[PDB]
């Protein structure tokens, strides 16, 4: 029941909702691969379907509108999902720890602002709520929040948010997302680049396409377009970073980001090829997060593997005890220091299942004894050794 469930502590509800990640609606759209299959699941359903919301919110919903009765389903879903105390504790608690589950940002429809709470993968909408409703449910503040650009939210809507958080309100928002609009064009960049001045709560960015990345980020493609790129003062104020969704990152690429300074954490997901030998970085950024991709090409570490003797090798680990053999001891430290200098600006490396790494893993023991090097069971490698 409800109050029995609410007489309970927080870890219980947390794990429960972790199992209920984000399915609050009674429906779900598919991925892309399941589109061309003509199989539609089933949604034969009926009225209590007001023409106040299907007409309003269609910019994020009416894209689909091609299946068994979905919108009346969606409509009554949005209706009944304004009173789930289930959901209110869901959000009080998910906010308490981390909202990696619900992606929660600003929106405007009809010129009326609201706060929408979506999936993360591409942010299919689930519901939204008013600011005053939201912070009557909770405490009002400059509660940091998220934002992203769609073909729904591009320029004037976007500039409407800008001028609203100027005139009516203040810029309570941090994090920016580039989920579509891969062209660097049709008014998104034109709107946003002059608009990152009242925009000083943030450190965090999310990126989608190799076109947009290569033509905005990878600083070898140097130009003199001032409004087409960032002002460098924000390039200081971006301690975090995220990016997804490309095929060939570093195959003979120009991978280098020294301008992208005062960065402190990188996140990468959903790609199909990568090599780290092309990769170049600033300092200050050691947190590296990497999610399900295809086979990775580790650093070379070949010459250094040729430097090695089985004088010491045991169990995949090594050490010189002999102080007398400064020959071997200095060699050991030279080896270890070359090793870390390959990974020099890195201390934490996370992998979800990427199915393969090809590049002769030899790592330090200080970090794998701990959980710095945090691989899932992408266990298709054997050339492991530790120092």
């Amino acid at each position: 029941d409800t109050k029995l469930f609410l007489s309970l502590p927080i870890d219980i509800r947390y794990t429960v909702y972790f199992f209920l990640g984000d399915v609050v609606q009674n429906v779900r759209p598919p991925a892309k691969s399941d589109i061309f299959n003509d199989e539609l699941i089933a949604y034969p359903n009926i009225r209590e379907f007001n023409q106040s919301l299907v007409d309003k919110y269609s910019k994020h919903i009416g894209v689909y509108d091609y299946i068994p009765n979905f919108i009346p389903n969606w409509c009554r879903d949005f209706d009944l999902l304004r009173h789930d105390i289930i959901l209110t504790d869901r959000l009080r608690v998910c906010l308490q720890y981390e909202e990696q589950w619900f992606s929660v940002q600003w929106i405007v429809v009809s010129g009326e602002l609201e706060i929408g709470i979506f999936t993360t993968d591409e942010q299919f909408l689930q519901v939204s709520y008013t600011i005053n409703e939201y912070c009557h449910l909770l405490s009002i503040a400059q509660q940091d929040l998220r934002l992203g650009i769609n073909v729904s939210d591009i320029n004037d809507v976007n500039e409407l948010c800008k001028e609203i958080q100027h005139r009516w309100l203040f810029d309570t928002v941090s994090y920016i997302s580039f989920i579509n609009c891969w062209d660097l064009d049709h008014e998104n960049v034109v709107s946003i680049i002059p608009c990152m001045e009242s925009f000083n709560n943030l450190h965090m960015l999310r990126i989608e396409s190799k076109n947009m990345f290569n033509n905005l980020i990878n600083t070898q493609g140097v130009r003199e377009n001032p409004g087409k790129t960032i002002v460098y003062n924000v390039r200081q104020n971006i301690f975090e970073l995220e990016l997804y969704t490309l095929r060939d990152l570093g195959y003979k690429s120009v991978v280098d980001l020294q301008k992208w300074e005062q960065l402190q954490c990188l996140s990468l997901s959903g790609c199909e090829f990568i090599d780290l030998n092309n990769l170049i970085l600033p300092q200050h950024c050691k947190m590296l997060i990497l999610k399900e991709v295809k086979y990775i090409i580790w650093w070379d570490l070949s010459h250094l593997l040729k430097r090695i003797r089985p004088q010491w090798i045991i169990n995949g680990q090594v050490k010189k005890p002999t102080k007398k053999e400064e020959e071997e001891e200095s060699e050991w430290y030279n080896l270890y220091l070359e090793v870390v200098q390959t990974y020099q600006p890195l201390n934490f490396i996370e992998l979800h299942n990427a199915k393969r790494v090809k590049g002769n893993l030899i790592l330090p023991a200080r970090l794998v004894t701990e959980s710095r090097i945090k691989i899932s069971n992408g266990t298709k490698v054997d050339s492991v050794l530790l120092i």
């Binding site: 029941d1 029995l4 469930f5 309970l8 502590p9 870890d11 219980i12 794990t15 429960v16 972790f18 199992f19 209920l20 990640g21 399915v23 009554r76 009944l80 009173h83 789930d84 105390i85 289930i86 979800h352 299942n353 899932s376």
Partner: protein, 126 residues
């Protein structure tokens, strides 16, 4: 080897030692009898029934969230837990006390199934 366990009522149940070293709170508390505060008799009976049904079984981790949400609701468990809500919640709290995670995960799985296979009328009462 075996160990006695005091249901806080005062009931001196007994377990095989290592089969209880399955648990982790025990595995630390020992490193023969132990107390068990705020637990009841049928509670611990059904607890050990699950614990004995799941002895040689394999469980992924307490960090592999993908394997975790990979959600095979065990059928033996699924029928085994077809009971009311208060005893259920007590089982859940006891699992929290004991650091025995997969049972807790299964309990939350079933409760999620309860609040997923729902009716609007549950809300129309509200």
């Amino acid at each position: 080897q075996n160990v006695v366990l005091v249901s806080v009522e005062g009931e001196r149940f007994v377990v095989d030692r290592k089969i209880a070293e399955r648990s982790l709170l025990l595995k630390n508390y020992l490193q023969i009898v132990m107390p068990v505060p705020n637990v009841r008799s049928s509670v611990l009976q059904k607890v050990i029934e699950w614990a004995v049904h799941h002895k040689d079984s394999n469980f992924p981790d307490e960090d592999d969230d993908d394997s975790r949400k990979a959600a095979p609701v065990d059928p033996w468990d699924r029928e085994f837990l077809k009971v009311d809500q208060e005893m259920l919640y007590e089982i859940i709290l006891a699992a929290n006390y004991l650091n025995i995670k997969p049972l807790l995960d299964a309990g939350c799985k079933v409760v999620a199934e309860m609040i997923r296979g729902r009716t609007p009328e549950e809300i129309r009462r509200t």
